[PDB]
Ligand binder design. Structure first.
Ligand SMILES: [Cl-]
Ligand SMILES: [Cl-]
Ligand code: NA
Ligand code: NA
Lengths: 298, 293
C-alpha cells in the first residue's frame, strides 16, 4: 500500500499477431503466481531483499523465461548465466557472470553478497566459491529446453539468409532491493557479458532513491549505465521516477540504438514499468492489493 | 584547445617507511616517461583513445605496476587480468575480465570495442575472441615477477589507468589491473566495469579509478563523477571532493581516481597515503607524484 513489488520476464518484439490467448495465459499465470508470492512476502513483513531474490528465483525456475531453467543457448549450444542482486539499505550487491553449473544464478549472486567480501565473481571461480559454500553442482543440460533450442536453430537460419528477468521491491520497513537474472542471448558469442550482472547497468538499488531492474540490448544498457542513471536523474537531476523513466527508456536508450525496458520503484513507493519495445512481460502490485499483469503496450 | 593527459599506477597504503628513495625514483622515472610519451602523442594530434591505450599499454609493460607484466598473484598462484577502455565521442567501450593468456589486456579490451558489437568479454571466451582476431596467445607465466610472488608468500600469514583530452576536444579513459595479491580466483573489482573503474563522455568527463574495488562498484564512482557534474552541475573539483573524500570513505572505500573534464580541467584526488600519478598539458612539462602535498 506503499510496500510494493514489480517483476519482469524480459522485453522484446513479442508479437500479439503471433500468439493465441491460451499461450498468453501461460505467461500471464506464471507472472501472476510470482508477483503474488512477492506480495504475500511483503504483506508478511519479509525484507525487500528476500522478496526480489525469491521472485527472481521463481522466474529462473519457470521455463517460460530466459533465466535459469529455460535459458537461451549460446553459439556453441551451451548456457552461460548471469545475475545481480542489490540491497538499497546497505548498498551492498552481489553478482555472478558466465556460470553454467549453478541451478539458480540469483542465489549464487546473493551468496557472493553475503558470504564474501566481494561484489562480483565470474566463471569457474564463481562456481567454485559457491560450491565451497554448499551450493549444488548441476549438469548444464538442466536448463535446456526444446523451445529455446529451436530459437537457436531459427536464428542460425536467419543468419544464413540475411531478454532477462527481474524484480524490484519496497518493503514495509522502507528498504529497496532489486535483482536481475539472465540466460543470455540466443546465439551469443561465448564469454560475452550484458547489463544483467552489472551493478548500475542492469541492476541497482538505493534506499535514498530507487530500485531498478533492466532487460534489453545489453551493450547500450551498459554504456548508458541505465539502472544508475535513473537514480542519478532523480537524485541529482530532480526528475520524478516517471520523468527519469521517460528520459532513459524512451529517448536516451533508443538514441544510442538500444531496445528494451526496465522496472523501477522509488523510496516513495511510486512504481514504473517503461519499455520502448512491442512487449515486456511484467507484473506489479502493492502489498494487500490485487496484482496487475501485462505483456503489450498501454 | 588544451589537450591534457593524466595517468595513475595505483592508490593505497604507500608508506614512506616501507619504501626506499631508489625504489621511489624508479616509480617517478616510469611515471614521467609514460606521461611524456602520452603528451607528445597529444601534441602530434593523436586521438585521446590512442593516447590512453598507449599509456595503459606502457603501464602494463612496466613490471613496476600491477597490470600486465608484474601483475599480482591470485590465491592459486595464477594471474587473472582485467581491463576496460571507453571512447567519449561515441560512448563505445571495450572490457575484458579474467584473462590469463593475453599480454596486454587494454589491447584486448580495445579489440572487444572495435571488432565486436560487444562491450564486455570474460575468461576463455574473451581469449578465443581475441585469438580469432589475430591477437597472440602468451604463457601466463610471462607476467610473473618475484617481487609479486614473495608478496603472495608473505600475504599467506592497485590498478593502472589513463585519461586524456585530445586536440579535437575528445575525451577517453582506460584502466587495467592484475587484481589483488592472494585474490579469490574469479573475483572482479571495478577496473573492467564501465562506470565503476572507467568512464568517458565528451559532454562531461573521462575517469579512471583505483582502490577498494568493491566500493568503487557499489558507488559507481567513475560515472558518479560525470553524473554529479552533468545533472548536479558540480565542478570537476566539487564532484571529485564529494566522491573520493566523502562518499567512498562513508562506504569503507579507499583509493582515488584521475579525471579530466571537457574544459581541460584535470583532477587527481585520493584519500589514501599515496597514489602513483602524473599529468601534463600538451606543449608543457609533466608533473609526477607519489605522496600528498
Ligand atoms: Cl497486456
Ligand atoms: Cl610525492
Ligand atoms: Na526460467
Ligand atoms: Na605492469
Amino acid at each position: 500500500g506503499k510496500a510494493v513489488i514489480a517483476i519482469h520476464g524480459g522485453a522484446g518484439a513479442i508479437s500479439r499477431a503471433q500468439m493465441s490467448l491460451q499461450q498468453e495465459l501461460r505467461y500471464i499465470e506464471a507472472l501472476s503466481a510470482i508477483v503474488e508470492t512477492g506480495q504475500k512476502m511483503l504483506e508478511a513483513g519479509e525484507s525487500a531483499l528476500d522478496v526480489v531474490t525469491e521472485a527472481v528465483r521463481l522466474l529462473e525456475e519457470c521455463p517460460l523465461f530466459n533465466a535459469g531453467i529455460g535459458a537461451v543457448f549460446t553459439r556453441d549450444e551451451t548456457h552461460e548465466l548471469d545475475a545481480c542482486v542489490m540491497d538499497g539499505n546497505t548498498l551492498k550487491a552481489g553478482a555472478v557472470a558466465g556460470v553454467s553449473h549453478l541451478r539458480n544464478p540469483v542465489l549464487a549472486a546473493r551468496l557472493v553478497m553475503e558470504q564474501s567480501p566481494h561484489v562480483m565473481m565470474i566463471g569457474e571461480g564463481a562456481e567454485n566459491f559457491a560450491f565451497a559454500r554448499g551450493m549444488e553442482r548441476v549438469s548444464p543440460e538442466i536448463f535446456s529446453t526444446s523451445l529455446r533450442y529451436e530459437q537457436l536453430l531459427a536464428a542460425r537460419k536467419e543468419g544464413a539468409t540475411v531478454g532477462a528477468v527481474g524484480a524490484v521491491a519496497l518493503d514495509l520497513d522502507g528498504n529497496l532491493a532489486a535483482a536481475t537474472s539472465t540466460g543470455g542471448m540466443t546465439n551469443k558469442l561465448p564469454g560475452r557479458v550484458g547489463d544483467s550482472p552489472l551493478v548500475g547497468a542492469g541492476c541497482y538499488a538505493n534506499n535514498a532513491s530507487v530500485a531498478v531492474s533492466c532487460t534489453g540490448t545489453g551493450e547500450v544498457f551498459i554504456r548508458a549505465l541505465a539502472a544508475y542513471d535513473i537514480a542519478a536523474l532523480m537524485d541529482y537531476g530532480g526528475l520524478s521516477l516517471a520523468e527519469a523513466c521517460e528520459r532513459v527508456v524512451m529517448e536516451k536508450l533508443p538514441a544510442l540504438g538500444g531496445s528494451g525496458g526496465l522496472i523501477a520503484i522509488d523510496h516513495e513507493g511510486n512504481v514504473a514499468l517503461p519499455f520502448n519495445t512491442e512487449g515486456m512481460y511484467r507484473a506489479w502490485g502493492y502489498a494487500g492489493d490485487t496484482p496487475t499483469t501485462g505483456i503489450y503496450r498501454e
